[PDB]
Amino acid sequence: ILSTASVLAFERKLDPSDALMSAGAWAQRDASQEWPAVTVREKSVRGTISNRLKTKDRDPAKLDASIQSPNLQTVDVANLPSDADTLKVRFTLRVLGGAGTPSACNDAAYRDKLLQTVATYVNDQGFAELARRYAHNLANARFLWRNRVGAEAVEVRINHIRQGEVARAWRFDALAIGLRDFKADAELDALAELIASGLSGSGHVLLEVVAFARIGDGQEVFPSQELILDKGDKKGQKSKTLYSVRDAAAIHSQKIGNALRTIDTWYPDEDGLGPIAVEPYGSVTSQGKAYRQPKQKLDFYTLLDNWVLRDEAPAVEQQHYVIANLIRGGVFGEA
Amino acid sequence: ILSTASVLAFERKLDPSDALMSAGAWAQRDASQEWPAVTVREKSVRGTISNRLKTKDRDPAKLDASIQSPNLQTVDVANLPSDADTLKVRFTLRVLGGAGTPSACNDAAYRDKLLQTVATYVNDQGFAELARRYAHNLANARFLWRNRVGAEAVEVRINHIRQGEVARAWRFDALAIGLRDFKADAELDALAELIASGLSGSGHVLLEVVAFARIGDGQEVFPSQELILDKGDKKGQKSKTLYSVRDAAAIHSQKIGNALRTIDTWYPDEDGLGPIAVEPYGSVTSQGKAYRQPKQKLDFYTLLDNWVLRDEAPAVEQQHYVIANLIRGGVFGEA
Amino acid sequence: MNAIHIGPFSITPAARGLHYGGLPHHQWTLYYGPREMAIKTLPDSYTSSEVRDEFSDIIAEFVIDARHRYAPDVLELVNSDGDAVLARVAVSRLPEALSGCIPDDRFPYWLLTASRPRLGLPVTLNEYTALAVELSAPPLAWITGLLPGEVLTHDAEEWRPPTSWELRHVVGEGSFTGVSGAAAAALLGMSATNFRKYTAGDSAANRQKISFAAWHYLLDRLGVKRAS
DNA sequence: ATAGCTCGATTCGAGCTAA
DNA sequence: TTAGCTCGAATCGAGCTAT
Fold first, then answer.
1. Residue C23 CA to D3 C1' — how many Å?
2. B136 with B214, same domain?
3. A335 by DSSP, 3-state: which?
4. What are the backbone angles phi and psi of residue C201, rounded to the nearest 5°?
5. Same structural domain, A280 and A258
């Protein structure tokens, strides 16, 4: 009957590194290895109430009393220096083979169907579309999440590494390649076999991904934010903390991986909004609506049952999605 | 039934940088790129009892005892050099655009109708009245808050920095363009479509604003103040702390952006005060009160639901207030 | 074992198990609705009333924090100096005519706020009692901070009926008021079987919604709102 | 006290007329 | 604002249950 195993833990492929930030100036991007790092400092903010009220009653004295004692906060803030207008973000992406092999399972019969159905998938169509689409999110600076909304010109330079030296260098203009359309380009195509060879297990791939963005002169850069333990008084609340590795602003590695995973364009709703991240139950917390509802037969879990247990193969664009949850890893299976 | 969204987080437009302050003498402002920065130094003060007493400390024995036990505290002080009478503040302002699009919004139906409402506003009239009042606050040294109340001659220079170079230059007289009325000027209107293009989203735009002010020799300059953790001794209380980035006194980014936000003249109360900032519930920190209270139905939130949900659009001057608050950005929706 | 439901809280166990030491063990997870507060690994030999006692202190801390951060504003009645507090009353909303005030001698009684930038209003004892009667706060008024503003509004067009989880905040054995479903039904003058349909969850067959008058009268009788 | 059910009777909302 | 009326849908009480 080939029941589903209890544990389906999968190793994460396309493993990124923490993208630390450094600051500098444009046209000096070649000798940017000695650029000063972006430090995270503290500043005090004061503000009045700007959120909605309870709206049950219309007392004016209470809202005026909130202006009598404005809230005082200290927030972690990261800014470029007054002599720098370019933000440098560098991280390394490690590409691993053996996508279909689970890290932990609970049935040898179940695994042998999984490793066979991903072999028949790769033989029919290998790691070509996903590797191409994972190349798009490295081409455009999607990992520059809020550092791309108003950049004058953001440039991505990635170098393939062998033995500790460059193998082949790619140079891209991230404004040219949009965040919506998955077009075709020769440098984008040439990057695809490198990702394809690493994903198929035929070779090792290490890429050093560098992004230079024209944020502006002394403007604000936006690293990842940490949790607030709320162990201080209401005035020194420390309401915002930013992630720094060693006195240098940095972006969480899982936030970088989320930008790479944004290749899903076959969710059941209208796809003109834009790509979403490949993820079970197609859920993104920005708009708060989860595409690929399990009530519909289009989420990752039910197709994984049809594509394996009862051998009901979906459309080939969906089989790219089912392996897209396998390549990103995850703790699957019924607990 | 088109209920409002629970989360309506909006990105802020018109993002300013920290305003660095350096000092010098007048008539050398054409070559002010090597002026020494206004340094932060420390001085000690003592004062007498100048506060009201709670009907018990008014006894002559108790009052004189407090004078015999003076409050010694150190304060943070910023002054110009004795040979310098000009204060310049330099910040960069970038205009983003796409003000109608929220970062987070739950109801897709509400997002489409809100985007339709913003697009309906843009077609009727663009961001011309908005940017005219925004450039008026850039024309005067309103962002030079307390260093303008006694300025003898204050002058601003605004430069359009497109490809890291001055694409178009501006020079205004801040005292002539007072902080009371929003008149029309050909040079001000020339700046108006520069921000209006940024607010509309046609192309990237970035400005540099330098405001020279005739302060006086060794006079007191007023940067933004900080919070004190209140942990040290009462003699070294540090009752005042000012903001600095690298041994140079500076003004907070949100302090500068608040002054550029000061375009709201449409609040129902009498105009003895003048323009205020466009933030919901019309809060004025100095007066401790709030114009546009929800009781008389002229705050941001009631106008937004009237414009979007039940389709009763407000007055055209009130539509300016709603979009200006939409440009201002905030965490809207039921938190 | 079974998911223990304590009012708005729900201690659900992990489907899988573990063996810490040699004894059987399970991961129990405290929930405040969709919010996760704690994971505690516990043996399988513990009864439900003992896992409840194990998770009781975190619930007590949550209730203390909720009562403190949502405490109603306190008003102070003072003499013509402002030093002696003659009477204090907690109010659900401030008086309409409050402005920034420092008491003087021309009026004997002043109604000031407890916040340090003290707003105030010159009143006599009769007007002070009128304001106290109009504006008083019920003893359990802090539970309104844990409830949405659209289920507590008095406007019928903008009112939304509370869900089952929002209803568990005020009725139930482990609720914030501590009244049973039978007592709540007796307060509304209805049968307990009909109120259990209000408090029913995940049972789509025969689940009902409370009405505007019933909800607001229940909030009146429990001491949560409208008890000025 | 929790949790949930069925079944016939009563209530309930949004149409409508009628004045 | 008074004074009603169908019509299907949701609610109400009082029987039972289960834990």
1. 32
2. yes
3. coil
4. -135, 145
5. no
Contact yes or no for B333/B6 (Cβ under 8 A): yes
Q: Are residues B84 and B94 in the same domain?
A: yes
Domain match, A179 and A289 both? no
Based on the domain organization, do B108 and B211 belong to the same domain?
no
How far, in Å, are B28, B295, C90 from residue C82 at the CA level? 57, 31, 18
Cα(B325)–Cα(B310) distance, rounded to whole angstroms?
20
Q: Of A53, A57, A335, which has the smallest distance from its Cβ to C16's Cβ?
A: A335
Domain that holds residue A254: 12-98+127-262
Q: Across chain A, how many H-helices and E-strands are there?
A: 7, 14
Burial level of C80, CB count in 10 A (0-12/13-18/19+)? middle
**What are A242's strand-pairing partners?**
A225
The DSSP element (H or E) to which A261 belongs, if any, is: helix A253-261
Q: Which residues contact C107 (CB under 8 A, 6 or more apart)?
A: C80, C122
* Whether residues A31 and A73 fall in one domain: yes
List the one residue out of B262, B227, B116, B299 whose CA is nearest residue A51: B299
Header resolution in angstroms: 2.7
C189 burial via Cβ count (<10 Å: 0-12, 13-18, 19+): exposed
Tell me: do A53 and A118 sit in the same domain.
Answer: no
- Provide the number of structural domains found in chain B: 2
Contact B260, B23 (CB under 8 A): no
CA distances from C121 to A66, B286, C76, C80, C132 (A): 18, 21, 11, 12, 13
Q: Exposed/middle/buried for A83, CB within 10 Å: 0-12, 13-18, 19+? A: exposed
Domain boundary pick from B262, B287, B313: B262
| Tokens 């504006």, located at residue | C135
Complete DSSP assignment for B43-78 = EEEEE---S---SSTTSHHHHHHHHHS-EEEEEEE-
Residue where a domain stops, chosen among A233, A262, A291: A262
Question: Obtained via which technique?
Answer: cryo-EM
Q: Which residues of A touch B252 (CB under 8 A)?
A: 43-45
Of B55, B288, B334, the CB nearest to C81: B55
Residue C75's CB is within 10 A of a number of other CB atoms, namely 26
Are B121 and B159 in a shared domain? Answer: no
Neighbours of B (≥3 Cβ pairs closer than 8 A)? A, C
| Residues in chain A within 8 Å Cβ distance of C111 | none
